[PDB]
Amino acid sequence: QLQRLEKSIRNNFLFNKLDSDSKRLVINCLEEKSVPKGATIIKQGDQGDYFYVVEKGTVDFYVNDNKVNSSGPGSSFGELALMYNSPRAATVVATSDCLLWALDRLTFRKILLGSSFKKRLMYDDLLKSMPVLKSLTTYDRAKLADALDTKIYQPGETIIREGDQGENFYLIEYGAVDVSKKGQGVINKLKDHDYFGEVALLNDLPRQATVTATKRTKVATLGKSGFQRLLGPAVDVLKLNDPTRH
Numbered sequence: 001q002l003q004r005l006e007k008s009i010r011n012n013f014l015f016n017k018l019d020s021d022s023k024r025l026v027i028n029c030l031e032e033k034s035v036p037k038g039a040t041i042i043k044q045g046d047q048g049d050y051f052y053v054v055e056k057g058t059v060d061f062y063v064n065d066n067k068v069n070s071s072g073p074g075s076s077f078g079e080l081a082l083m084y085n086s087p088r089a090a091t092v093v094a095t096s097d098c099l100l101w102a103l104d105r106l107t108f109r110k111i112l113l114g115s116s117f118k119k120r121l122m123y124d125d126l127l128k129s130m131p132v133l134k135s136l137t138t139y140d141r142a143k144l145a146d147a148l149d150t151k152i153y154q155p156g157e158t159i160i161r162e163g164d165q166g167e168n169f170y171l172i173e174y175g176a177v178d179v180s181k182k183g184q185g186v187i188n189k190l191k192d193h194d195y196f197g198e199v200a201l202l203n204d205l206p207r208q209a210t211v212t213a214t215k216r217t218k219v220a221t222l223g224k225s226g227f228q229r230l231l232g233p234a235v236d237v238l239k240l241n242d243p244t245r246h
């Protein structure tokens with residue numbers, strides 16, 4: 001029917017949110033696929049063909065044959081392979097028999113990456129290129145991206161001040177910054193693909209130094225709650241690099 005569809009959409013965060021042009025342009029395209037309990041829907045490593053939204057049924061998610069996740073009706077999956085052109089990041093096994101609505105790679109790139117996952121698209125180069133972020137899987141980079149805001153600082157602007165409360169952690173997209181400490185002047189300098197602002201957040205301390213743009217500098221910024229959950233791999237390197245130690 002066309003009522004099951006208009007309900008699919010009204011209840012999906014990605015879709016209820018598109019303009020009726022994208023919205024029309026997506027109910028037209030959804031193909032439905034039934035699947036028996038015990039069928040693999042997508043295999044880890046495979047090329048990404050489709051995006052799925054679960055009408056009825058339940059799935060289990062396996063990363064290297066561990067099992068990591070679980071979803072029911074309303075939930076969607078298969079979006080990372082298509083937005084990024086990477087292999088499948090997880091195997092998705094059917095846990096009870098299911099009816100899935102499928103968007104082909106082409107329409108996904110047409111409507112949904114354009115608009116639902118805009119952020120993931122924009123930060124993808126930063127996140128793939130930052131050294132401290134190398135251990136992150138595409139699923140991780142995606143969750144991290146959703147949480148980032150962008151700020152541009154100009155020459156001579158203060159980004160953070162020694163002694164302040166910290167709230168954000170910072171990833172330099174391009175630019176140049178000086179780190180300074182009263183009594184000591186400039187003690188370090190950062191640039192594209194450096195990060196700063198973890199010491200306050202890792203240790204619950206005030207900011208331990210002032211950071212000042214010396215060129216036009218674009219950062220992505222991540223709040224404390226996100227720093228606590230979205231950097232899982234990278235977090236051990238941040239504690240290991242932490243200048244509050246020798």
Ligand SMILES: Nc1ncnc2c1ncn2[C@@H]1O[C@@H]2COP(=O)(O)O[C@H]2[C@H]1O
Pocket residue numbers: 042048061063068069076077078079080081082087088089090091092139
């Ligand atoms: N822990 C996880 N790691 C990787 N992918 C996951 C995880 N949990 C759920 N997924 C979803 O499972 C899908 C497997 O295929 P994709 O990489 O295209 O998109 C993936 C996500 O949409």
Ligand SMILES: Nc1ncnc2c1ncn2[C@@H]1O[C@@H]2COP(=O)(O)O[C@H]2[C@H]1O
Pocket residue numbers: 160166179187188195196197198199200201206207208209210211243
């Ligand atoms: N030698 C250093 N001492 C203090 N902070 C530094 C140093 N080098 C780089 N920084 C960065 O400057 C940041 C200032 O705020 P935070 O203390 O939150 O986190 C600090 C580090 O990320």
